[PDB]
């Protein structure tokens, strides 16, 4: 068959049921909330528009964060 919930939703189900549900709400909120780390090695694009090469028209742009590896140390 096929799983009704994708793999990423499997973790959510465990968090919502069992001992995870019994966990303190404050701790659950801390786990649930995600805050983006402050950029260090990458800066956001200065311009918000650029000329699309394919159609030759101005298009919106996106920011790609630089990959950085943080060792366990």
Partner 1 sequence: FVRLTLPPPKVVDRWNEKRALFGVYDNIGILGNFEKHPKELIKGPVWLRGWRGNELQRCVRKKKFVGNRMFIEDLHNLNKRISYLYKHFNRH
Partner 2 sequence: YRAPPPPRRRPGPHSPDPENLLTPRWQLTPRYVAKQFGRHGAISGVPPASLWPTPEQLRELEAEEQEWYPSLATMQESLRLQQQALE
Partner 3 sequence: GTSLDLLRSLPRVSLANLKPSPNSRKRERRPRDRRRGRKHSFRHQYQPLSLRRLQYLIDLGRVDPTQPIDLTQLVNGRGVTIQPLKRDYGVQLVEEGADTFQAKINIEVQLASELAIAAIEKNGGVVTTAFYDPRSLEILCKPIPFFLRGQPIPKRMLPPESLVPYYTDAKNRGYLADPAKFPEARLELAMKFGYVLPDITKDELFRMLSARKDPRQIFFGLAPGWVVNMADKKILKPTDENLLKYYSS
Task: List residues near partner 2 by CB under 8 A.
Answer: 5, 9, 12, 49
Which 7-26 residues touch partner 1, going by CB under 8 A? 7
Under the binding rule (CB under 8 A), the answer on residue 51 touching partner 3 is no
Instruction: List Cβ neighbours of 50 (8 Å cut-off, separation of 6 or more).
Output: 58, 59, 61
Which span (3-11, 25-33, 49-57, 62-70) binds partner 3, by CB under 8 A? 49-57
Instruction: Identify whether the C-beta of residue 68 lies closer than 8 Å to the C-beta of residue 38.
Output: no
- Token pair for residue 27? 């701790």
Chain residues that interact with partner 3, rule: CB under 8 A:
55-57
């Amino acid at each position: 068959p096929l799983h009704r919930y994708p793999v990423h939703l499997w973790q959510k189900l465990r968090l919502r049921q069992g001992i995870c549900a019994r966990l303190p709400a404050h701790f659950l909120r801390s786990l649930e909330e995600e805050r983006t780390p402050t950029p260090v090695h990458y800066k956001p694009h200065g311009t918000k528009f650029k000329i699309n090469p394919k159609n030759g028209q101005r298009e919106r742009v996106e920011d790609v964060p630089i990959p950085v590896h943080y060792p366990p140390e």
